[PDB]
């Protein structure tokens, strides 16, 4: 069972985004 | 702690955002809104330890061609998506997407992802394709391109029915970690 992956679990800390893209984010995030 | 960054790319309206929202939240988006950029994150247990899976959602629109690659640094795995009922999107895997991601990230693995498979046996969709003498992409054809372009693996799914959907991400995760 070593390569078994769980269902995803919501609401983790999003990975860093390049700051210049910040304003282009959302609203879907 | 442990992280995997996955970036999703592909032609407009092949279903990138639906794939991501359906996988991460089990809901299907109720209206089409073209993406510019979006960034989602979930936790997945792998052999019983938690990884943060960061999912970067990108614009299929050509007008974002110069901005898109700013999201690529430190990517661990790409999903290059085409709809199995859009031959143009499949052609663009070869003509646009794989060249783009491999230029910027030559060492980074990618999966070829066929989307919208629920429409492959949908009479209305086939009728629509047949108007222009088109046909859906078969798995055999996709596997061949995946081998030729050196994708890790071809996987396919439906965001709508969720058939194959978890398997797509399972394979992306494993590809990132190999
Ligand atoms: N039947 C079906 N329709 C789908 C599926 N995935 C997406 N769609 C539909 O295809 C359209 C585009 O979906 P979307 O995920 O927003 O596409 P995108 O690739 O994110 N587009 P963009 O590049 O502009 O952000 C929507 O009308 C959506 O309902 C699927 O698995 N099955
Ligand atoms: Mg989108
Ligand atoms: Mg990293």
């Amino acid at each position: 069972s070593n390569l078994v992956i769980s269902d995803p679990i919501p609401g983790a800390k999003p990975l860093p985004v390049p700051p210049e893209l910040a304003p282009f984010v959302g609203r879907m995030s | 702690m442990q992280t995997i960054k996955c970036v999703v790319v592909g032609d407009v309206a092949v279903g990138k955002t639906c794939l991501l929202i359906s996988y991460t939240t089990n809901k299907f988006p109720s209206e089409y809104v073209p993406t510019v950029f979006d960034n989602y994150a979930v936790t997945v247990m792998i052999g019983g330890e938690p990884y943060t899976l960061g999912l970067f959602d990108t614009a299929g629109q050509e007008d974002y061609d110069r901005l898109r690659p700013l999201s690529y640094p430190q990517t661990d795995v790409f999903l290059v998506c085409f709809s199995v009922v859009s031959p143009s999107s499949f052609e663009n895997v070869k003509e646009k997407w794989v060249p783009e991601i491999t230029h910027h990230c030559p060492k980074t693995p990618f999966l070829l992802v066929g989307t919208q498979i629920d429409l492959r046996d949908d009479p209305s969709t086939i009728e629509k394709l047949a108007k222009n003498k088109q046909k859906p992409i078969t798995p055999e054809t996709a596997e061949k391109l995946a081998r030729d372009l050196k994708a890790v693996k071809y996987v396919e799914c439906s965001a709508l029915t969720q058939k194959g959907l978890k398997n797509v991400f399972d394979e992306a995760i494993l590809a990132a970690l190999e």
Side-chain angles (χ1 to χ4, degrees), chain A residues 2-26 28-29, chain B:
Chain A
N2 296 171
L3 296 179
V4 181
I5 297 163
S6 71
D7 280 315
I9 302 151
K13 189 180 201 215
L15 299 185
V17 170
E20 69 267 44
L21 292 190
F24 295 101
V25 149
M28 178 58 90
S29 309
Chain B
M1 322 205 114
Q2 303 190 270
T3 66
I4 297 155
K5 164 167 175 180
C6 174
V7 174
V8 183
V9 303
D11 277 9
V12 184
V14 298
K16 300 179 300 296
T17 296
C18 287
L19 197 136
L20 289 170
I21 293 300
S22 181
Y23 170 70
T24 64
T25 77
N26 290 316
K27 288 173 174 206
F28 194 81
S30 69
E31 63 178 281
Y32 169 46
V33 183
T35 303
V36 184
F37 287 105
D38 281 291
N39 185 40
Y40 314 112
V42 296
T43 303
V44 305
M45 298 300 117
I46 304 179
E49 293 287 352
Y51 288 65
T52 300
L53 177 62
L55 300 158
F56 290 53
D57 194 8
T58 76
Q61 296 251 344
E62 277 235 298
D63 286 342
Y64 289 107
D65 281 348
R66 282 148 141 157
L67 286 191
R68 195 180 306 105
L70 300 171
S71 69
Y72 294 171
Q74 302 304 285
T75 298
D76 293 310
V77 63
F78 290 93
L79 298 189
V80 179
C81 302
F82 68 95
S83 163
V84 303
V85 290
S86 172
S88 62
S89 75
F90 181 67
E91 185 169 43
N92 282 327
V93 167
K94 186 183 188 192
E95 289 276 1
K96 180 173 179 112
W97 300 111
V98 174
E100 176 170 303
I101 62 160
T102 63
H103 174 75
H104 287 100
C105 300
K107 322 180 141 67
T108 298
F110 69 94
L111 278 59
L112 182 54
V113 182
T115 62
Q116 303 185 346
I117 67 183
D118 58 285
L119 298 177
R120 192 186 254 143
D121 59 351
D122 180 54
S124 170
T125 301
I126 297 319
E127 293 162 11
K128 169 149 97 184
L129 289 176
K131 281 285 193 144
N132 291 308
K133 297 212 112 226
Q134 315 181 91
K135 297 177 199 303
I137 307 296
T138 67
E140 173 195 348
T141 300
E143 287 289 352
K144 183 176 142 50
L145 185 64
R147 193 59 148 237
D148 294 342
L149 297 184
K150 293 199 48 42
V152 165
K153 160 90 173 167
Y154 169 65
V155 290
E156 54 178 41
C157 67
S158 173
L160 184 51
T161 66
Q162 300 202 324
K163 173 178 218 275
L165 182 63
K166 181 176 180 302
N167 181 247
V168 164
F169 288 93
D170 285 354
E171 286 293 328
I173 286 159
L174 294 176
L177 296 190
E178 167 108 340

